[PDB]
Amino acid sequence: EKKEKQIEQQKKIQMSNLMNQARLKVLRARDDLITDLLNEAKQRLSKVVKDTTRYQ
Amino acid sequence: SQGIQQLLQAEKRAAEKVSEARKRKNRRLKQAKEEAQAEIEQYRLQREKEFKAKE
């Protein structure tokens, strides 16, 4: 029963770590998306630098 | 009389048989702790197979 509790605890650790990796994937994706707004804002600013009237 | 002699010999054999039976059955009662191991090891093996199936 102690050995069985240890294996059930290892199963529960694996389930917990799998859910943790899922949450960390979801969060990494949110950051990647906001980072692509930052990248696109850099691109938009680079286009604005070619508008010599507004850029002046 | 030969009748009481023969009767006392049968009565003596009877007393010996029950006294020897007591000693035999007392020795058999001591074996219970040694014979118990055959079931104890089967319970270990049953829990071990169940544990492997849970893994």
UniProtKB/Swiss-Prot annotation, chain A:
Gene expressing this chain: Atp6v1e1
Tissue: Expressed in brain (at protein level).
Domain of life according to the entry: Eukaryota
Section of the entire sequence shown: 58 to 113 of 226
Upper taxonomic lineage: Eukaryota, Metazoa, Chordata, Craniata, Vertebrata
Family: Belongs to the V-ATPase E subunit family.
Signal peptide (residue range): none
Subunit structure: V-ATPase is a heteromultimeric enzyme made up of two complexes: the ATP-hydrolytic V1 complex and the proton translocation V0 complex. The V1 complex consists of three catalytic AB heterodimers that form a heterohexamer, three peripheral stalks each consisting of EG heterodimers, one central rotor including subunits D and F, and the regulatory subunits C and H. The proton translocation complex V0 consists of the proton transport subunit a, a ring of proteolipid subunits c9c'', rotary subunit d, subunits e and f, and the accessory subunits ATP6AP1/Ac45 and ATP6AP2/PRR.
Compartments in which it is found: Apical cell membrane; Cytoplasmic vesicle, Secretory vesicle, Synaptic vesicle membrane; Cytoplasmic vesicle, Clathrin-coated vesicle membrane
Species whose genome carries this gene: Rattus norvegicus (Rat)
The protein's role, per its UniProt record: Subunit of the V1 complex of vacuolar(H+)-ATPase (V-ATPase), a multisubunit enzyme composed of a peripheral complex (V1) that hydrolyzes ATP and a membrane integral complex (V0) that translocates protons. V-ATPase is responsible for acidifying and maintaining the pH of intracellular compartments and in some cell types, is targeted to the plasma membrane, where it is responsible for acidifying the extracellular environment.
Protein name, entry field: V-type proton ATPase subunit E 1
